Design a binder for this molecule. Structure first.
Ligand SMILES: *[C@@H]1O[C@@H](C)[C@@H](O)[C@@H](O[C@@H]2O[C@H](CO)[C@@H](O)[C@H](O)[C@H]2O)[C@@H]1O
Ligand SMILES: [Cl-]
Ligand SMILES: [Mg+2]
Length: 254
């Protein structure tokens, strides 16, 4: 005993975790002339809203710093997110070590705590020169994320980019032209790289829900002649029928 229904699946919800390398290897001139415009062009291409893309943003250096939480004003309003980038241009100087594993671990923590939206595509954008505090540890956590169906895109930034590491953590194959998971040019190429990951595509599918067993049919409304009775059941799903009335006859009336 189940119920079938039609619905549209568009995958419009995306939790996008932007992890930004703010470590000392990035280089200040690179930060100003390349990273900031990268962030502006990238975030400007993201049509954030309550119902679709929600941005999370972390800056990782010696420590990790959570800049934007999923669901807040700055998470769902592109203009507010761009203000954060401006704040970083004016007040942040890249310095220190590179807590890439800890930053990826913040994504893990979202999944573990069930803070993400269950129906949302989980998308990590890792923006880095690819020189983490520990290569093995960063690969390990990235691989754990992938095994939980999290998509990972890598954007190369910084004065001295380790493309080999970036390509490895992104999952790029050797002898393969134009990896779909790694980009290291300008914001235009980054935007184009991200697009297929977040595209809304609507299909119409059928769905099945289990409504469970019915309660016993009640006694007939009349003890003689033609009457009615009913059976009920708790709603285990929105589109499950909960009540049901049929006719009955307890003989004839004298
Ligand atoms: C249940 O027991 C039966 C043997 C009858 O005595 C039923 O009574 C009758 O109820 C019907 C309507 O259901 C009336 O139209 C009759 O006038 C009445 O005798 C009793 O409810
Ligand atoms: Cl690390
Ligand atoms: Mg570094």
């Amino acid at each position: 005993d189940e119920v079938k229904y039609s619905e549209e699946v568009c995958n419009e919800q995306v939790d996008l975790y932007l992890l930004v390398d703010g470590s000392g290897s990035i280089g200040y001139p690179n930060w100003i002339t390349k990273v900031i415009p990268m962030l502006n062009g990238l975030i400007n291409s993201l049509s954030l809203s309550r119902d679709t893309i929600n941005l999370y943003m972390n800056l990782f250096g010696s420590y990790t710093t959570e800049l934007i939480r999923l669901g807040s004003g700055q998470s769902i309003d592109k203009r507010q997110a761009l203000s954060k980038v401006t704040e970083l241009r004016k007040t942040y100087t890249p310095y220190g070590t590179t807590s890439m594993t800890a930053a990826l671990d913040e994504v893990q923590k979202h999944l573990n705590d069930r803070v993400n939206r269950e129906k949302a595509i989980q998308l990590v954008i890792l923006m880095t020169d690819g020189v983490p505090n520990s290569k093995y540890r960063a690969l390990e956590v990235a691989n754990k994320l992938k095994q939980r169906n999290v998509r990972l895109a890598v954007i190369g930034i910084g004065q001295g980019i380790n493309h080999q590491f970036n390509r490895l953590i992104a999952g790029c194959r050797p002898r393969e032209p134009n990896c779909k998971f790694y980009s290291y040019a300008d914001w235009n190429e980054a935007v184009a790289l991200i697009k297929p990951f977040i595209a809304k595509v609507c299909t119409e599918v059928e769905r099945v829900a289990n409504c469970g067993p019915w309660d016993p049919w009640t006694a007939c409304s009349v003890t003689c002649g033609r009457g009615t009775h009913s059976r009920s059941r708790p709603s285990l799903h929105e589109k499950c029928t909960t009540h049901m009335v049929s006719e009955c006859e307890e003989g004839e009336c004298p």
